[PDB]
C-alpha cells in the first residue's frame, strides 16, 4: 500500500512480508461497508447522477481485481506473493547487472525500463511453463 | 507504418488443430476471456457472470488455479466408441464437443459428488494419529 | 485393460453460436470542435482499431 514507493527494490521486499501491506484486506473491509444496504433502505430513492457513477465505479472494482487474480491464476502462482518460475531471464531484456536492479533502483523507474518488454514476458511464462508443466505432470501420472 | 508476422500463436488459433497440438495452446484462450447507451454495461456483467461459473466449477472439482488436472473418475467406454489414438491425434475440439454434448451433465455430477466430495470426508478423517 | 479417469481442461478452444451485444467502435479523429456527428455520437467508442 505504497508505503515504500521511494524505497529500493532490495529493501522493499523486507516490508512486503505484511500482506502487500494488507492490500486486499482493505477491499473486504471496504465492501463490507460499501455494501451498507442504505442503498436498499432507499432504492436510491430515484436513479441519480451519483448512482450512475457508483455503478460504473463498482464494475472497475470488479474487473481490475479479476485481471490480477487471473494472471496470477494462470501463472501457477495463485494466491501467493513471491513465487519463482522456470523462465530464464534473457539479458536482451535488461543489460543492467544484479545489484543495480535491487540495491540501487526504485520501482516506478524499473517499470519504464521494461514496459516495452512486459508483454513478451507474459506469454513467455504461460506457454513456456504453465502450459508446459501440466502436460509433463500428466505424463508422470500415466504410469 | 508497422508490421511483422506471427510469433507465438493467435486467438482461437488452434481451433482447427488436433488435441495434441491444441493442448499446448490453452493460455491464449485463457487470458482474453475476461478483458477484451447502457448496453455496454449489460455486456460487462454477462462477461463476468460467465467467467465466475467456469471458475466456480473448477473450484469444486479440486482443480482451481491449474489449467489441466486429473481426477480419479473412471472414463466409461459407453460414452465414447472412439479409439484412443484417434482422439489425441485426429479429432479437433470443435467436433469433440458435439459428440459428448449429451453426456456432459452426467460427467459434472460424477466429478463432485463422486470424488471431490468423497475426497474430503476421507481427507478430514485421516487425522487422529 | 487399464482404468481410465476423467481429466479436466481449461481454455479449450470450442464454441457454439450465440447472439450477444456488439458495440460501436468508430473513428476518433476530428470528432471534437462542432462535429456533432450523429453516426459517431461524438466518436461512440474512440478505439480506431488495429484489425488483426
Amino acid at each position: 500500500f505504497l508505503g515504500a514507493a521511494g524505497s529500493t527494490m532490495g529493501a522493499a521486499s523486507m516490508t512486503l512480508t505484511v500482506q502487500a501491506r494488507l492490500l486486499l484486506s482493505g477491499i473486504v473491509q471496504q465492501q463490507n461497508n460499501l455494501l451498507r444496504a442504505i442503498e436498499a433502505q432507499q432504492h436510491l430513492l430515484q436513479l441519480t447522477v451519483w448512482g450512475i457513477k457508483q455503478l460504473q465505479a463498482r464494475v472497475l472494482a470488479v474487473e481490475r481485481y479479476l485481471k490480477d487474480q487471473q494472471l496470477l491464476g494462470i501463472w501457477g502462482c495463485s494466491g501467493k506473493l513471491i513465487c519463482t518460475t522456470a523462465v530464464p531471464w534473457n539479458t536482451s531484456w535488461s543489460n543492467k547487472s544484479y545489484n543495480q536492479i535491487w540495491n540501487n533502483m526504485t520501482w516506478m523507474e524499473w517499470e519504464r525500463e521494461i514496459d516495452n518488454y512486459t508483454s513478451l514476458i507474459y506469454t513467455l511464462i504461460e506457454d513456456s511453463q504453465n502450459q508446459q508443466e501440466k502436460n509433463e505432470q500428466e505424463l508422470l501420472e500415466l504410469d | 507504418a508497422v508490421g511483422i508476422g506471427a510469433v507465438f500463436l493467435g486467438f482461437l488459433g488452434a481451433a482447427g488443430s488436433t488435441m495434441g497440438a491444441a493442448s499446448m495452446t490453452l493460455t491464449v484462450q485463457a487470458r482474453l476471456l475476461l478483458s477484451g447507451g447502457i448496453k455496454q454495461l449489460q455486456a460487462r456483467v454477462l462477461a463476468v457472470e460467465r467467467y465466475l461459473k467456469d471458475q466456480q466449477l473448477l473450484g469444486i472439482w479440486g482443480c482451481s488455479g491449474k489449467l489441466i488436472c486429473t481426477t480419479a473418475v473412471p472414463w466409461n467406454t459407453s460414452w465414447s466408441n472412439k479409439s484412443y489414438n484417434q482422439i489425441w491425434n485426429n479429432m479437433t475440439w470443435m467436433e469433440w464437443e458435439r459428440e459428448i454434448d449429451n453426456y456432459t451433465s452426467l460427467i459434472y455430477t460424477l466429478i463432485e459428488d463422486s470424488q471431490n466430495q468423497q475426497e474430503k470426508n476421507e481427507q478430514e478423517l485421516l487425522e487422529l494419529d | 485393460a487399464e482404468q481410465l479417469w476423467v481429466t479436466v481442461y481449461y481454455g479449450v478452444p470450442v464454441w457454439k453460436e450465440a447472439t450477444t451485444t456488439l458495440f460501436c467502435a468508430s473513428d476518433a479523429r476530428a470528432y471534437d470542435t462542432e462535429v456533432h456527428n450523429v453516426w459517431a455520437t461524438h466518436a461512440c467508442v474512440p478505439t480506431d482499431p488495429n484489425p488483426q
Partner: nanobody, 134 residues
Framework: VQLVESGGGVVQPGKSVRLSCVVSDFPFSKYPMYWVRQAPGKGLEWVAAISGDAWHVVYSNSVQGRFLVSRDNVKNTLYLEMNSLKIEDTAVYRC????????????????????????????WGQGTTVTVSS
C-alpha cells in the same frame, strides 16, 4: 553526427558491389536505418530499411530480391550489397538515419506477431555514387 559511405564507383551490368556506411556516435543498435536513391535530375526513390535488431528488412519492389542490406551493431557499420545491376540503377545512394528513436518489437496480445515501427529520416549521409555502363 558524422555520416558518410564508401565503396562507390562505376561497374558493368551483371556485377555486384557492396557499399559501407559508417556512423559515428549515437547508439547504433537502438536505431533503424534506410536507403534512398536520388536519380540525377529526378526526385527521390526509397530503397530499403532494416530494423534496429537487424531482424526486419523491407525492400522496394523494383529492386526486390536483387540487393542486400545488413547491420553490425558492434562495428557500427551499414552495408548495401547489390546484385544483377542495370544501367538505370545509376544514381546517388544515401545512407540515412531515422528521425525518431524506435523501440523493441511490440507483440500484440491477440495474435502472436511482433511489430517493428518505422518512421522517416533526418540525417542523410552525403553518399557515394554507382554507375552501371560499358
Amino acid at each position: 553526427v558524422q555520416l558518410v559511405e564508401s565503396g562507390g564507383g562505376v561497374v558493368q551490368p551483371g556485377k555486384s558491389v557492396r557499399l559501407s556506411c559508417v556512423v559515428s556516435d549515437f547508439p547504433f543498435s537502438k536505431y533503424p536505418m534506410y536507403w534512398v536513391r536520388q536519380a540525377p535530375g529526378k526526385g527521390l526513390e526509397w530503397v530499403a530499411a532494416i530494423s534496429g535488431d537487424a531482424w526486419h528488412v523491407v525492400y522496394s519492389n523494383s529492386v526486390q530480391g536483387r540487393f542486400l542490406v545488413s547491420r553490425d551493431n558492434v562495428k557500427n557499420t551499414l552495408y548495401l550489397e547489390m546484385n544483377s545491376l542495370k544501367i538505370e540503377d545509376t544514381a546517388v545512394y544515401r545512407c540515412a538515419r531515422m528521425f525518431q528513436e524506435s523501440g523493441p518489437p511490440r507483440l500484440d496480445r491477440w495474435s502472436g506477431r511482433n511489430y517493428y515501427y518505422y518512421s522517416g529520416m533526418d540525417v542523410w549521409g552525403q553518399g557515394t555514387t554507382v554507375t552501371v555502363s560499358s
